[PDB]
Amino acid sequence: KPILAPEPLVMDNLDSIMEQLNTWNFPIFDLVENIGRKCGRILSQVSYRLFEDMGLFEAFKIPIREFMNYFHALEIGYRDIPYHNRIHATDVLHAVWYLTTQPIPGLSTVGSYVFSKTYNVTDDKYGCLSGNIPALELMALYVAAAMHDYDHPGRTNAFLVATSAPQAVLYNDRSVLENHHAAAAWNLFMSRPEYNFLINLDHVEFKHFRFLVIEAILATDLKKHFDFVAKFNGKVNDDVGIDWTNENDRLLVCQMCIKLADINGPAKCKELHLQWTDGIVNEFYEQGDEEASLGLPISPFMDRSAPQLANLQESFISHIVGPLCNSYDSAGLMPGKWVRKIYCQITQHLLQNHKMWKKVIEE
Amino acid sequence: KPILAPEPLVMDNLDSIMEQLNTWNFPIFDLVENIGRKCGRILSQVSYRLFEDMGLFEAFKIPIREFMNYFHALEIGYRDIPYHNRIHATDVLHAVWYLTTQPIPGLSTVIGSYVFSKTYDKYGCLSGNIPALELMALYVAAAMHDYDHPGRTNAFLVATSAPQAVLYNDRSVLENHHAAAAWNLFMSRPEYNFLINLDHVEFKHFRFLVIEAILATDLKKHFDFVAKFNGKVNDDVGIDWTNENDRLLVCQMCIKLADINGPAKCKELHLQWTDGIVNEFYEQGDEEASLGLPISPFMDRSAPQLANLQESFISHIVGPLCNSYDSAGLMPGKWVRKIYCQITQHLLQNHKMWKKVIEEEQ
Ligand SMILES: [Mg+2]
Ligand SMILES: [Mg+2]
Ligand SMILES: [Mn+2]
Ligand SMILES: [Mn+2]
């Protein structure tokens, strides 16, 4: 009855690709091909490596069997849809891990904290978020990333609301998908003792952990995007700036992190970004087909007979991703390298991809 | 499948009690006894009278059969529990109707379709300032706002990881459920479609307003609403009746006051509601004990603390809400210039009563 983790828990044939997790442009589609498309193991295998990298299994005395059981059940419940699938979830988890573990130039760091085995810079002039965000909160962020699109139907909130879908009625039209992802992932977790990887958290810790997970998942609703960005910019630019000893400031940083991780695509290398773009529109077209079937007008960018890739991505960058990156970068939280100047791979890719789409539009 | 409204849709022989709807201390428990306890008709019968009083049937071409079918289905889905039952829903509907239709001293009329009570310079009423569609949303919200309440608090559902708490991610667990279950009920059958003559835009807006009103009844958000309202009252210009967001906030404050009206009623009514509230709490206390949890404050039948419960509820929740609402100039009242406000007078009297009980208990 329970979905259990397969075979030997850890797949041994993935070592050369898994070693490359510590790069921003992780070749996730190579990992997909290496594991097999619809093998249904990518999320659990990556989650294991990242938790091991951070020493989170030891930190919270996490039983590995139950961890693998849960993450396998979770990944199986991501649908076989073109974008909001277990590969995207894995991508978002990798991105939050990267953003929280990799060197950030000029960040001061503060036991209750974990650090990546990949963290090699001995220079005072770098820090990382995992030096400032307690391990319990970091683990909540990582678990949130893994569960944040669970059981996505391949339709937007707007479609669910407009069609009075049962889920939209159930959630009173408020963050319909994001509520469902959190609630269905938590229901799954609670359903079986074979999934209880959090058994060694005390009651207070567990309740706090759950709260943090929910807050992070719910922050992925883009209806709230401008409010988060405005609030963060406010905190950065007030009298003291970000206060790492303040739990509310730390939550806001975690929310900005999962937000950036969710929409990381246009800040990846061209090859990755173009592959993800294909997934996004292919999912949209299935929605467009259903809209037509229901006699509704086809939503912008969702008409397979009239594709608008460049307009979609150019406007997504200009309106959503660009301002979020600028805000996060202004706070001094982007990974980068001293060269002193700073070289920031992430913002460089975003600029390059924005230029690319603009040029497509021009032609 | 569908629950349909009984017999002749409107019960005759209730006329003498129904004529008293236009008083604040409406004798609702006499109405209960007159209709019959667990007749399961009180909410639909009162709903009919108030919609008729406002001419809402004509205003929105509402078919009476479908209206009665829906409101009867709705009332049947309120459980037989001591407080959050169909009698409380009826009470809250009556209170929102009273607050929106009765004379308010010095309230100006906005310079939309509006409706007025058949019961209606120096006075105004809210129904003169809030469009009929929005008023109707508020009334429907009041009727559905505790639908299928299980007789346990949000905090209990959250602490016990109840399926509803998991479903709603611990956020306004009951209130989300009331709205969602009442709307699901509505949509389930064509026999319930009393809003058939609203156009699509109107319907979607109506649904939004109903949800916003029901969700506003979560007391976790109490101080946020009060602070926001006090902000709007005391800013540049005050309440702007032509502003849809200001109007929504007023409607939310209205349903909030209506929900917790009990301590602002005459002693007889307040004491009867108090008995219901604690009896429902004690069932929760019994279950807490059964589950090996500590018994929540005020929920221990072996050690009742009615006076401490109600004194603190008035001082911390009802009192500040009334003060905020009164500061906005929205309380029904009479010119004596000074104003005489029955509602705040009752609240003062009940507060004094509980304080005296506490004094004798020490
Ligand atoms: Mg999502
Ligand atoms: Mg309630
Ligand atoms: Mn996502
Ligand atoms: Mn209520």
Author numbering:
A (entry chain A): 669 to 778, 799 to 1027, 1069 to 1092
B (entry chain B): 669 to 779, 799 to 807, 812 to 1027, 1069 to 1094
Provide excerpts from the study.
DNMDP and related compounds, or velcrins, induce complex formation between the phosphodiesterase PDE3A and the SLFN12 protein, leading to a cytotoxic response in cancer cells that express elevated levels of both proteins. PDE3A is a well-characterized cyclic nucleotide phosphodiesterase (PDE) that hydrolyzes cAMP, cGMP, and cUMP8,9. Here, we show that PDE3A and SLFN12 form a heterotetramer stabilized by binding of DNMDP. Moreover, we demonstrate that SLFN12 is an RNase, that PDE3A binding increases SLFN12 RNase activity, and that SLFN12 RNase activity is required for DNMDP response.
To gain insight into how DNMDP induces complex formation of PDE3A with SLFN12 and how trequinsin inhibits this interaction, we solved the high-resolution crystal structure of a modified form of the catalytic domain of PDE3A (PDE3ACAT-Xtl) in the absence or presence of DNMDP or trequinsin. PDE3ACAT-Xtl is comprised of residues 669–1095 with two internal loops between residues 780–800 and 1029–1067 replaced with shorter linkers to aid in crystallization and improve diffraction quality of the crystals. The catalytic domain of PDE3A crystallized as a dimer with two dimers in the asymmetric unit. The structure is very similar to the structure of the catalytic domain of PDE3B23, with which it shares 69% sequence identity, with a root mean square deviation (RMSD) of 0.53 Å for the main chain atoms. The PDE3A crystal structures are essentially identical, with only small movements of the protein backbone at the active site to accommodate the binding of AMP, DNMDP, and trequinsin.
